[PDB]
Design a protein around this ligand. Structure first.
Ligand SMILES: Nc1ncnc2c1ncn2[C@@H]1O[C@H](COP(=O)(O)OP(=O)(O)O)[C@@H](O)[C@H]1O
Ligand SMILES: [Mg+2]
Ligand SMILES: [Zn+2]
Lengths: 90, 312
């Protein structure tokens, strides 16, 4: 079936879908190429949504709602554990 | 430059504390700035401001912070001075460690410097592993090295996960990569590349082996691959396709490969690629770090006891 060369990986217990690699050629160790060359030479977690423009997603109301909520208390809990030792200016 | 101004705007409190000079890092999850601040205690200090992408979940941000707070500041693991937040904008402040580019120093390290580098990487890995942190992104850009000062720092816990019995509480709430946040394919262990559900601290030891491989062969990046299976194909060409298939069976993965390729002798591989008197213990340690079986792969603690590191 599969055109060569190929690599195929599957889970022995059906947990994953099979996946594949096919290239023109398998990796070849190239000792002739000079050092240091290799011898072989978005989504928002907060809103649980794929976005197209970071800046515009950030400026959306659903992102604004999450950003200005109690959700970062987990971060503030740690920060309150740290000593501030910089000089602060007004 | 507009980045500097927009960092100030997103986190106004930074204005009162830091003179932000330069942008010294960028990745998909963070930008890093170099800054100057005054310490209450007296001197000025150079500071690294790590600005996390505002899309990161609070749990992910908190987890990295917690790794820095709890495990860091000791044994070549970066620590944290403070952390600043306005809303979804979170900036971690760390001591700035001036460091070499890995490429630039690669072909100029003495062999003794290569031993020290590795010894110091294993101290950091030992530290984090005692806390049950799997780093998941060990590679030269996350291991900072100051050649002049002989100073070393493991950074970047943005991809970290917890072992089953992790001491970092927040890491329990971090979605597993195999369950659901991907590193550089070329530093990822076969059990990561094959999406093994069980990924232990052993994956970090593999990555240290890849670094060690670069050091011994003078080639960086050694595995140059844009995806996981290409890196796996390249690993098979080094460690042998038969040997890789056998080992993968032991962790519940079945690999089929078109061309059978033989395992390479590590010494001859590195020597042909690349000091006059590299001991056998170096290639023996390398062989253990690049153990295809994650159960038998050497641990950070055992690595520090390895004959390669007598007497240091
Ligand atoms: N404490 C620090 N001192 C000096 N440089 C740093 C420090 N932290 C990060 N950097 C620089 O910024 C780069 C990116 O930081 P890192 O924490 O790895 O985040 P990411 O890889 O997500 O961009 C690093 O590879 C390093 O060069
Ligand atoms: Mg990094
Ligand atoms: Zn969002």
């Amino acid at each position: 079936r599969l055109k060569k060369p190929f690599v195929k990986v599957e889970d022995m217990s059906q947990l994953y879908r099979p996946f594949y690699l096919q290239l023109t050629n398998m990796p070849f160790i190239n000792y002739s190429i000079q050092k240091p060359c290799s011898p072989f030479d978005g989504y928002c977690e907060c809103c649980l949504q794929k976005y197209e423009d970071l800046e515009t997603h950030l400026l959306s109301e659903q992102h604004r709602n999450f950003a200005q909520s109690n959700q970062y208390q987990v971060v503030d809990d740690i920060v309150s554990k740290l000593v501030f030792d910089f000089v602060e200016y007004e | 430059k507009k980045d500097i101004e927009k960092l100030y705007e997103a986190v106004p409190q930074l204005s009162n504390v830091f003179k932000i000079e330069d942008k010294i890092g960028e990745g998909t999850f963070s930008s890093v700035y170099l800054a100057t601040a005054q310490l209450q205690v007296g001197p000025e200090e150079k500071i690294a401001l790590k600005h996390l992408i505002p899309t990161s979940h609070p749990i992910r941000i908190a987890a990295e912070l917690q790794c820095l707070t709890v495990a860091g500041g000791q044994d070549n693991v970066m620590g944290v001075k403070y952390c600043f937040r306005k809303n979804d904008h979170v900036v971690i402040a760390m001591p700035y460690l001036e460091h070499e580019s890995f490429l630039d120093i690669l072909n100029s390290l003495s062999f003794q410097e290569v031993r020290e580098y590795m010894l110091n990487l294993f101290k950091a890995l030992k530290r984090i592993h005692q806390f049950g942190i799997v780093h998941r992104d060990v590679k030269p850009s996350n291991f900072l090295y100051n050649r002049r000062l002989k100073k070393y720092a493991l950074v970047d816990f943005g991809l970290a996960q917890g072992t089953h019995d992790t001491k970092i509480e927040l890491l329990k709430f971090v979605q597993s990569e195999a369950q659901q946040r991907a590193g550089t394919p070329g530093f990822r262990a076969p059990e990561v590349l094959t999406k093994c559900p069980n990924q232990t601290t052993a994956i970090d030891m593999w990555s240290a082996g890849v670094i060690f491989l670069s050091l011994l062969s003078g080639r960086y990046p050694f595995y140059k691959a844009s995806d996981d299976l290409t890196a796996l194909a390249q690993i098979m060409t080094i460690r042998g396709s038969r040997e890789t298939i056998q080992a993968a069976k032991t962790f519940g993965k079945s690999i089929l490969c078109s061309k059978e390729v033989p395992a390479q002798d590590l010494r001859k591989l590195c020597e042909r690629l690349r000091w006059n008197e590299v001991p056998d213990e170096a290639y023996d340690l390398l062989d253990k770090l690049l153990d295809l079986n994650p159960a038998s792969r050497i641990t950070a603690e055992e690595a520090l006891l390895h004959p390669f590191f007598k007497d240091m």
